[PDB]
Amino acid sequence: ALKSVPIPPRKNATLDHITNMIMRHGKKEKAQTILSRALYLVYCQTRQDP
Amino acid sequence: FVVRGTGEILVNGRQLNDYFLKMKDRESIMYPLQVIESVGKYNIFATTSGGGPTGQAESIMHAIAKALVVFNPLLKSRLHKAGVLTRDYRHVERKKPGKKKARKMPTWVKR
Amino acid sequence: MNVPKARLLKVAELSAKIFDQNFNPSGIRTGSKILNERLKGPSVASYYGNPDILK
Amino acid sequence: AKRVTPGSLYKNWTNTTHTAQLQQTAVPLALPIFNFDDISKTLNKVVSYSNKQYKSLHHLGSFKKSQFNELFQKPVCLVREDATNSFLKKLVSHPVKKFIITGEPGVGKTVLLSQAHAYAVDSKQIIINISYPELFLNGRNDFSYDDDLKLFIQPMYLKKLIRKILKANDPALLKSIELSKDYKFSNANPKNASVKPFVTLNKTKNTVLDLLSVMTHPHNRGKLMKAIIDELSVQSKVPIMFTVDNFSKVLTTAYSAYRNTENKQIYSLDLQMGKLMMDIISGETKFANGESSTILAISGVDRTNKTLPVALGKIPVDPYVTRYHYEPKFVELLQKGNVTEFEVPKLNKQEVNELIDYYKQSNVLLDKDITGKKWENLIDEKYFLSGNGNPRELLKSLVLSHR
Amino acid sequence: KSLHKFRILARSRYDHTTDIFKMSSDKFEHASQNARYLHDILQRLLAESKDLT
Amino acid sequence: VVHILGKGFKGKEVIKIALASKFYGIGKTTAEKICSKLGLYPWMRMHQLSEPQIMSIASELSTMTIEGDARAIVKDNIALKRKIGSYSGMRHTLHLPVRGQHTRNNAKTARKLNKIDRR
Amino acid sequence: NENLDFYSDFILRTGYYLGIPLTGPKPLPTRRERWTVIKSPFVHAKSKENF
Amino acid sequence: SANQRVSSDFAVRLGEELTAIAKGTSSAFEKRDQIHKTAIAHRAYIQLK
RNA sequence: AAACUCCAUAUAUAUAAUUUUAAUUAUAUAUAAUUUUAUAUUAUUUAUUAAUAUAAAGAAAGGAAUUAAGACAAAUCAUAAUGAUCCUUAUAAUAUGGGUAAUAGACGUGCUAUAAUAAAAUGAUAAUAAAAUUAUAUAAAAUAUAUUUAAUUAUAUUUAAUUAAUAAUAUAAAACAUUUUAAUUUUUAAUAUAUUUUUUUAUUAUAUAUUAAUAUGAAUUAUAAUCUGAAAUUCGAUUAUAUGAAA
Ligand SMILES: Nc1nc2c(ncn2[C@@H]2O[C@H](COP(=O)(O)OP(=O)(O)OP(=O)(O)O)[C@@H](O)[C@H]2O)c(=O)[nH]1
Ligand SMILES: [Mg+2]
Ligand SMILES: [Mg+2]
Ligand SMILES: [Mg+2]
Ligand SMILES: [Mg+2]
Ligand SMILES: [Mg+2]
Ligand SMILES: [Mg+2]
Ligand SMILES: [Mg+2]
Ligand SMILES: [Mg+2]
Ligand SMILES: [Mg+2]
Ligand SMILES: [Mg+2]
Ligand SMILES: [Mg+2]
Ligand SMILES: [Mg+2]
Ligand SMILES: [Mg+2]
Ligand SMILES: [Mg+2]
Ligand SMILES: [Mg+2]
Ligand SMILES: [Mg+2]
Ligand SMILES: [Mg+2]
Ligand SMILES: [Mg+2]
Ligand SMILES: [Mg+2]
Ligand SMILES: [Mg+2]
Ligand SMILES: [Mg+2]
């Protein structure tokens, strides 16, 4: 059963890159929160997947 | 300690959410149980010690991958290709004697 | 800290007498640390070795 | 310059989401209406509050920020047998009716309080709710000393509280309660007060509605609050449900941020608000109605000490603990009131399933979870990622975990 | 009662977790003197603890 | 705008912080004591003062060392040092550091601020 | 470590023949002291050596 | 572009810009067109190399 | 040169009565990789082969030391030692004070800031480390003090245990949650308003200025105490009440 299923992705690539661009001084949770907060906003205003 | 059951986890006797605030640490811990689609079939009892949260979480994930092999030995490759069965040798490198924090040097003046 | 201070200090000086220990309830400067400090003279004096080494 | 146009978001994230009307774009999903008398049909199933319940709860402050409500057109709840049904059965059957809601941060203590409020509204009850006790402990409201009451009075906080009590409870019950004794308050009406210096209320002719609707001067607002509590305590017609959320804040800061004329902190029990709260908890007020209850809830945002666990009998009494971490007076005041503990349990697998399902129906999930992931795997993984059933963490993983 | 008095007079020298009394001495310049000093202090504490008058 | 002893205050700033800032001689603690003595809640603003309250603040704040009095005390202390003939007085006269700092480098702010008529 | 281990082994043998139960050499953690010093005699502080 | 907004939290301002872009309303597109027009203005110098 | 070497890594054996506990460890010996195998797409001296990718077998990926011959008459006679030359009542030896800390200018290194992808408070079943130190000692807990109930911070009172896988230095801090934060009228409060209640809406007040130093920033200085020392003026370190430059 596990053959046909691909390996689940390591981690999203574009989101990792964007976080790393925001991230600075080694503070990644702050960057992820900022990005996740913004994406939560854009969904609430557009009701489309961010 | 991995024993079959439902998706229950405990770190040092505490809940996963209490111990690991970051959701990425929980995701890393759960990845082995996700490479193989058996997230809701095993009970984890993690007893990490040493280092900071990410080192603990990633050591838990590595230990889980090692423990899952005993349950189905012909699932080793899937985990190996997933990279969870390799030990991350990366670690802090010693502060070099004549310079600042290792691999950094004080400002060099031409004249 | 419900227990009255009188009881606590009664235990304090009783133990002090039992264990041969100073009791200074008021906190005045008794200068005890001056006397109790160890003498380091023997060690400092032999910094340069035995002067009676054969020549 | 103007800078901020009339339509624009300028506050931080939490206040922006809390107050921006982001629920306007939410799809109007149809759900069964909350009703304890029909618990058999709404059990283990998401529900929406009744319109009158929504009005009363909004006026009581049962819905707070950081609850993700803005995701949906209106706040919704899940009827959890272990948390909602069990608690309400205990509340109805137990004779003392004095509880404190406890649980891990984010488990849903507030929600359970709001469900209790919904029960009270639909059971023809009067609700007095202290949503954020910090407002009368943080030193951002006026205060004065009333020698007649021997307590410090906070007129702004009172005015808001009576306003909330008036606008939350149905006028029918407040009218149905007649005053047991006369009152004579100063008059502060913008126009009438020029002619009439004082306002009088008489027995069996005016109700508590008129008492709530009167307007006096700040130094007498404490008299009005004491009268209101006494009137509702003596009357034995309607039950009174006194609720306080974030009670751990009260239990931890025994001393407020107010300083008297000698630059000394004003003990909490020297305030009127703290005193009446503790009198109700300890049973000194002694409401006459049998069904009158007192439900308290703690919040994780507030520090923790040895006060509450000792009060709840969870740990013994160590008398050498500093007052900053153990307040014996509050412990004996809580124990004297026979306040019992209710622990909100974490979600199980099936509860998570229902919640996530409803989230799917509301179009609040990512396509990675929906478009591609198996439902079973999704539920299990989220159950794992949410610390085995923490509702806040579950919501965070679904809509606030873009990674 | 004597045990409670003994425990509260030992102060930091007694740990309730394991119930072990603990005491060391090196003021005197020989082991024999320190052992006698410790024994005498233990006798003194026991005598006072048993005196509940 | 609230005027206390000739000091201009905006209507938005807290009493304790504003008092501690504008007046020479009263700091955070003194302002807190002043506000507490007159029964103004900790985070009260300058808008909400009434005329009696402003008068009380001005009256009670005028029974302690005023800006001018405190400046006089400082200047008198410097003058004492200089008239005695002490080393410190000499540094004050020459616009040089007085607390044993190095002059080979820096010592700019001392030259700019140290003097016999220090504010 | 070589002399330590050899002597330990000897201690165990002597104890056994003397009737003394002995558990055996337990490896307590080693202690690493560290000093640093400039290699040059006069002035090359950039060059340092660890002992 | 998101740093030209009045809020004090960049999560809010990032969200506002992203929402605006999602509806095709922002000045960043002009920069993209300018770069492409410049690339066209430099058609013939590309070489296989 | 590379390799042997050391730190680190994976595994095996041994030791430890799992109260020196942690066995998730410590340290002795050994094995392991300067990875192997297969396939294909390449250019080629034609697989009697290289790089490109794939596959599968693996835990397997780093750092440190070692910097040759000669050249720079590079540095060192102030680590120490010797040759030559020079002083020998002085260029040798001791003590009390001062200087090495002076300040026009200039200069190389750094520390701290100039605010909202950032500063401050709080967080007691005390979130989570590693490596080092304690017979010329480390110094807990409790106390009085400033200081209010307490906590935090700094002294004083007294030395608990430990000369160490045992006790102390020592509850790591960022992280994360809550509250606050001037410029900012984007704020407060006075009334009403209400299905945004820790909150929205309407009216009035929230003035006087503009490229600006704030509730940024802590330089300079006044005073009172404290620590070490026999001694704190030239010339030491902390705390408190004021000061609050430049940026
Ligand atoms: N639908 C639904 N959401 C719930 C329920 N219980 C909790 N939640 C959600 O879980 C989160 C936390 O709920 P709260 O009631 O604030 O939890 P709490 O434990 O009282 O929170 P703290 O006081 O901060 O510890 C919010 O997102 C709630 O909406 C429930 O029964 N139904
Ligand atoms: Mg580092
Ligand atoms: Mg809550
Ligand atoms: Mg001032
Ligand atoms: Mg063990
Ligand atoms: Mg080599
Ligand atoms: Mg060479
Ligand atoms: Mg050459
Ligand atoms: Mg030369
Ligand atoms: Mg020379
Ligand atoms: Mg020489
Ligand atoms: Mg001489
Ligand atoms: Mg020098
Ligand atoms: Mg240098
Ligand atoms: Mg800042
Ligand atoms: Mg260690
Ligand atoms: Mg070690
Ligand atoms: Mg201490
Ligand atoms: Mg901590
Ligand atoms: Mg300027
Ligand atoms: Mg400041
Ligand atoms: Mg200061």
Among candidate residues E45, D17, H23, the one with its CA nearest the CA of residue C14: E45
C2 and chain D in contact, CB less than 8 A: yes
| CA separation for the pair D93, B84 (Å, rounded) | 54
Quote the CA–CA distance of B84 and B87 in Å, as a whole number: 8
> What's the CA gap between G4 and G6, in Å, rounded?
6
Atom of ligand 1 nearest to the CA of D245: 23
Which residues in range 42-101 of chain B are in contact with strand I, contact meaning CB within 7 A of any of its atoms? 47-53, 56, 76-77, 80-81, 85-87, 89, 91, 93-94, 96-97
Angstrom resolution of this structure: 3.2
| Cα-Cα-Cα-Cα dihedral sign, residues D332, D140, D148, D273 | negative
- Distance CA(D296)–CA(D330), nearest Å, equals 14
Q: How many CB atoms lie within 10 A of CB D324?
A: 12
Token pair recorded at residue D367:
């396509």
Start-to-end CA span in chain A (Å): 32
For residues D396 and D352, what is the distance between their CA atoms, to the nearest angstrom? 13
D89 φ, ψ to 5°? -60, -45
B7: nearest CB among D383, D390, D397: D383
Q: CA G47, CA G39: separation in Å to the nearest integer?
A: 6
**Residue found under tokens 């003062």:** F49
Q: Do A36 and D13 touch (CB under 8 A)?
A: no
Q: Which nucleotides of I are covered by protein (CB under 7 A)?
A: 8-10, 14-17, 19-20, 23-24, 26-29, 56-66, 75-76, 78-80, 101-104, 106-110, 116-118, 122-125, 127-133, 135-137, 139-144, 148-151, 156-163, 165, 172-179, 181-200, 205-209, 214-215, 219-223, 228, 233-237, 240-245
Residue ranges lining ligand 1, Cβ < 6 Å: D 67-68, 76-78, 80, 103, 105-111, 299-301, 355, 391-392, 395
Could you say which residues 8-27 of protein chain C have a Cβ atom less than 7 A away from any atom in strand I? 8, 21-25, 27
Helix E2-10, helix C5-18: angle, nearest 10? 80
Residue with nearest Cα to nucleotide I129 C1' = B51
Residues of chain A by 3-state class (helix, strand, coil), percent to 5 = 60, 5, 40
Written as six digits, the tokens of D206 are 């005016």
Cβ atoms of residues D71 and D20 within 8 Å: no
Cβ of C18 and E8 within 8 Å?
Answer: no
Contact D57, D131 (CB under 8 A): no
Single-letter amino acid code for the residue at D342? F
| Ligand that comes closest to the CA of residue B102 | 2
Query: Which residues does D197 contact at the CB level (< 8 Å), separation at least 6?
Result: D186, D187
- Taking alpha carbons only, the member of F7, G2, D121, D22 closest to residue H15 is D22
Determine contact: D400 vs chain A, CB below 8 A.
yes
**How far apart are alpha carbons F33 and G36 in whole angstroms?**
55
Length of chain G: 51
What backbone torsions phi and psi does residue C53 show, to the nearest 5 degrees? -75, 140
Report how far ligand 20's centroid is from the alpha carbon of F100 (Å): 28
- In sequence order, what are the beta bridge partners of D199? D185
CA distance G31 to C49: 27
Shortest-distance atom of ligand 1 to CA D246: 23
For ligand 1, atom 31: residue with the closest CA: D78
Question: Rounded to an integer, what distance in angstroms lies between the CA atom of residue A29 and that of residue A36?
Answer: 10
With CA of B93 and C1' of each nucleotide, the nearest comes out as I63
Which helix (H) or strand (E) segment holds residue D101: the answer is strand D98-102
Distance G48 CA to ligand 7 centre (A): 19
Q: Is A37 on the interface with D (CB under 8 A)?
A: yes
Within window 336-395 on D, which residues have Cβ closer than 7 Å to strand I? none
| Residue H34 CA from chain centroid, whole number | 10
- Confirm if D47 and D34 have CB atoms less than 8 A apart: yes
Which mutation among D14, D392, D394, D396 tests ligand 1's pocket best, with the greatest number of atoms within 8 A of CB? Answer: D392
**Contacts of D73 by beta carbon, 8 Å cutoff, 6+ apart:** D23, D26, D27, D28, D29
C28 Cβ partners below 8 Å, 6+ apart? none
- State the DSSP string of D301-326: TS---SHHHHHTTSS---TTS-GGG-
Residue D176 CB-half CA count within 13 A: 13
- The CA–CA distances, whole Å, from D10 to B39, C9, D79 equal 42, 60, 36
Taking the centre of ligand 17 as the mean of its atom positions, its distance from the CA of residue G31, in whole angstroms, is: 8
Rounded CA-CA distance D162/D156 in Å is: 10
- State whether the beta carbon of F27 lies below 7 angstroms from any atom of strand I: yes
Query: Would you say B95 and G48 are in contact if contact means Cβ atoms under 8 Å apart?
Result: no
The number of the ligand nearest the C-alpha atom of G29 reads 17
Structure-determination technique: cryo-EM
Structure-token pair, residue D310: 């000792």
Structure token pair of residue F46: 């300058």
Closest Cα partner for D277 from D235, D238, D334, D227?
Answer: D334
Q: Ligand 1, atom 1: nearest CA belongs to which residue?
A: D77
Q: Is chain C touching chain B, with at least 3 CB–CB pairs below 8 Å?
A: no
Contacts of D203 (CB under 8 A, 6+ apart): D178, D179, D180, D181, D182
Read off φ and ψ for residue D46, nearest 5 degrees. Answer: -60, 140
> SS3 of E15, please?
strand
Asked whether E23 and E41 are in contact (CB, 8 A), the reply is yes
Dist CA G51 CA D50 (whole Å):
78
Contact list in F for residue D141 (CB cut-off 8 A) is 41
Which DSSP string corresponds to B40-94? TSEEEEE---SS-HHHHHHHHHHHHHHHHHHH-GGGHHHHHHHT-SS-----PPP
Q: How far is the CA of D279 from the CAs of B71, D94, D152, D240, D334, in angstroms?
A: 60, 21, 16, 14, 10
Q: How far does the CA of residue B91 sit from the closest CA of chain D (Å)?
A: 25
